[PDB]
Design a protein around this ligand. Sequence first.
Ligand SMILES: [Zn+2]
Ligand SMILES: [Zn+2]
Lengths: 359, 358
Amino acid sequence: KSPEEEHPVKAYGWAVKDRTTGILSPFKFSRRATGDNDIRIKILYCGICHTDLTSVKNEYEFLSYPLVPGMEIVGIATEVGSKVTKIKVGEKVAVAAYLGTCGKCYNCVNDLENYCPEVIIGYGTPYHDGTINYGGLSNETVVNERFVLRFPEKLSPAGGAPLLSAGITAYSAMRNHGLDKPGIHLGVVGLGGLGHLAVKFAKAFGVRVTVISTTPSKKDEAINNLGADAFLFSRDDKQMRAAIGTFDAIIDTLAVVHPIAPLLDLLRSHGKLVLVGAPSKPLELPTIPLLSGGKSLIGSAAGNVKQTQEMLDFAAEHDITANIEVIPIDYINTAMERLDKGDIRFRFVVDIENTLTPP
Amino acid sequence: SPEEEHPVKAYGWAVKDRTTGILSPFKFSRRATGDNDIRIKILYCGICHTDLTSVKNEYEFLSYPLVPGMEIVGIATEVGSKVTKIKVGEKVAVAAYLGTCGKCYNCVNDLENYCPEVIIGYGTPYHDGTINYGGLSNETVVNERFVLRFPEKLSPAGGAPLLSAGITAYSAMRNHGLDKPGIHLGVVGLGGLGHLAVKFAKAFGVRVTVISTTPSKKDEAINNLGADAFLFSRDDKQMRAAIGTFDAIIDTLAVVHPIAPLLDLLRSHGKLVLVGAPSKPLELPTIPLLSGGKSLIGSAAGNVKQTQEMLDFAAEHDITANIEVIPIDYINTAMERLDKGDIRFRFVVDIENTLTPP
Ligand SMILES: [Zn+2]
Ligand SMILES: [Zn+2]
């Protein structure tokens, strides 16, 4: 069938129609009717993350096109299924970075569902009904209540949107591995959308933070704007040899290939290097440092919906928001170009309600 | 000069030309017994892959002539004035390392094997600047801190490989909770380290699947060792069937090899423990690591308190290595066989009866 015929309820947004160019354009489609456990969401803001860019750059083999990207959604519940009681129509809600899970593995039943082997990602893949999921650059969406969050009333809807993928990924990796207790000297490699949010949460956790980066012109943003206690330029072997053995843990946010040996030397014995960015190619692990130091390489991806709701409540109390540029949807293609060059501090957020036009 | 460097004469075998790797008879000397030192008459010295890598000229920092060997079992012949833990004439063993700085965090809390300035068994300077000579020699002198009491009821020959291979397996399991029944543990590589990892797991009551590329080890793994299962690491069907079934995996391989298949074998949040030291670097796929939320963990040997505790746990549960006792002048042939994995599972040199005086 056609996108507008495939489902009963009409919907519209922007979508990459030709995967070889990556250009989004207005797109008409449809969404399933509200099930008994479903929430219909009028989308207000949609953050743009690196996953969107990679998708747009035609580097995701499995994705179906036309592709409606966007997986950091903030909106309003317009309709709720018969069985839904946690949310009422008219309340502010947010969507998790994933839309569903098998529901029968250990992870799912113990509320660690983001690690389910059969996790359904925000968009580009089939749902439990076989139909491709359309993401957040659209006027409305429908999501199972389990994967819909309650948005704190005292949190900027626009500024809170990037928390739903970038935020949770940093929050969960820190909480789950004990990088949230005051006293720790924590390194954050890479000052991007993910990196800048790792710094904000650490400061609100009371953690000493050195921003590790290549770009030396980010020093001012790292210290003055973000609140980093120190800054390491990753070319000055004087700085490097001085910091050897000084870090209890390091969060690596880099999406690009990069050496690992220098980062392990920066750790004290039994220190942990947490990888949360998805490198394009595989990196090379230096066994000699890992073994002699007794160090750990640890991967982390997003977080469970219970963590996501707890993180959202923790950001209202401590006024944690992202540094965002709110853009109209027809600026998306220019924004993608700027994101490809790192020409953003630090997060695009599309205003869906006011800049998306029906037809 | 080697014969003059210290007052007391000694002899062994050594690699004189680092470019060939051939050991030959070698005369040298050792320091006099300090106030806190124990002199050990060496009986048996295990041979590990570290020795082979050393003789294969893959450690640039090692000084030559190189006397290898770091799994020493012997007898204390004479002890310093202050030494009280050991009595002359009792069986002793040496740790895989010879000294530490003594004032970093690791040192002062008895985690000294992770000291940044740890002095390895041989080939690097001691606290007095002189190169250390390893266990393929007639006697050694070691600070009392790094000398262990060898249980009387334990084979000196079969116990020798515990001091590097054993402790490395023991500590990696104890430190990461791979010693409590309920765990499905994988052991990659059925060599000296791998086979001893299996024995300790059985005595811990842990379920052990041996993962190997050599299908001819299946019979020894299951019947002789006691492995609960055996997985051929190139049999895709077998591998794709075990996906997600392992709580942890101990990787003992000294050679470069893919890790992505080993990560799929782990359940979410599972741990891959590295105890083998490949010369070259491995290729780390981040997609499996991230999506599964898994961990890559390195481990090296263990502390002297653990090493003594491991030695006491092996006496009680009768854990020894499966060894071939060899004369010292067979060492060059033994290295060749070890390079091809033609051993089940550990060479042990008989120093007392086969080392000839100078
Ligand atoms: Zn599941
Ligand atoms: Zn030390």
